[PDB]
Structures are given as C-alpha cells and as structure tokens.
Structure 1
C-alpha cells in the first residue's frame, strides 16, 4: 500500500505510483445470487433436515451453543464449519419458535 522506500520494516518496499486495477469476476466466485438463494431455500423445504442436523438442534436447545458446536466440529470436521452449521441451524430454530 503505502511503501516507505526503505528495505526493511513495518511496510518495507519501493515507492511506486499506485494504480488499483479493475476487479475480477472470479474474485466473486462463491457469491450469493438470488436465484440460488431461491433454489436452495426451496430444496430445503422439500427435503428437510439430515439426521445429524436433527441431532444438532436438539443439542442447541439443550446443553448449549458450545456443547453442540463441538459435536458439529467433530461431524463436519473443522471447527469453522461447525459454528457455520450452528448459526445456520439457529436460524432454523428462529423460523420455528417465533413462526
């Protein structure tokens, strides 16, 4: 970004007139789109939950968002995707209780 012209340190680099190049479509690869949003929501209505998902929600409304998050992390494999399931399943629980 703002180089300093010096060979070393907390933003080392040779100074140059910047030039921010146009964005690539690629860099928007996992990008939403209202079509897929419609399709995925619809497909989920028709299909329902998976048994572990069904297990997951029973673990959210019990124990906690922690206890259940570990279970998810173990099942999907990766702590990040776990939380991601829980948040997604929490939104399903919203759309149940306060229908």
Structure 2
C-alpha cells in the first residue's frame, strides 16, 4: 500500500523501511492435509446422510436452490454456513446419483 507521510488521507502514516518477516505456522490451522482427506472421505460413505440432509437434496431436486438455502439457514445457524452446505449437496447429487 505504501504510507503517504502526512497526518490524514487515504494511506495515512509515516514512511519507514520494511522487513517482511517469516510466516508463522499457527496461521495455517484450517488447512486440510492428506490424512484428513482420506479419513473424512472414508467416514462419509460408512455413516451416510442425516435426517435434514434427506430433505435438503429433495428441495434442490424438486423446488430449487433458493428454497434449499432458506431451510439450511434455519437448520444450521447462519447464512454463510447455509451457502456452504447447499454447495456440498450439489456434489453429493452430482458425484453419486448421475455418474
């Protein structure tokens, strides 16, 4: 971004020469790895779908993805998790049933 050198503005601050240090490992916490991929893949085929996920794929197959989100937002807590879950269910319908 680079600092301007004045007291107010868009890039507010003072010009000083930088270092940009080494990246920490703790920042990469969410990251998957190969052991988890195989594991999570192998547990899903054993366990199968839950009761709301038998109604969730039927709302996509019949009505549509607007009606599917509304339920997934009410079933899960939030709007951002209801985006994800619906996208996960468009791969469960795509990968298993058709192909």
Give TM-score scaled by structure 1 length. 0.94
Following superposition, the deviation at residue 33 of structure 1 comes to 0.5
Following superposition, the deviation at residue 98 of structure 1 comes to 2.7
Following superposition, the deviation at residue 91 of structure 1 comes to 0.7
Equivalent positions of 1:3-82 (< 5 A) are 3-82=3-82
Structure 1 spans left out of the alignment, 5+ residues? none
Following superposition, the deviation at residue 21 of structure 1 comes to 1.3
Q: Distance in 2 between matches of 1:18 and 1:4?
A: 15
Following superposition, the deviation at residue 5 of structure 1 comes to 0.9
SS at match of 2:17: coil
**Deviations 1:23-64 (CA, angstroms, capped at 9, x unpaired):** 111111010111101100100000000111111111111211
SS at match of 1:80: helix
Root-mean-square deviation (CA, aligned residues, Å) is 1.0
Following superposition, the deviation at residue 11 of structure 1 comes to 1.0
Moved over 3 A (4+): none
Q: Distance in 2 between matches of 1:52 and 1:30?
A: 26
Structure 2 spans left out of the alignment, 5+ residues? none
Following superposition, the deviation at residue 20 of structure 1 comes to 1.2
**Deviations 1:45-98 (CA, angstroms, capped at 9, x unpaired):** 000001111111111112111110111011101000001000011111111233
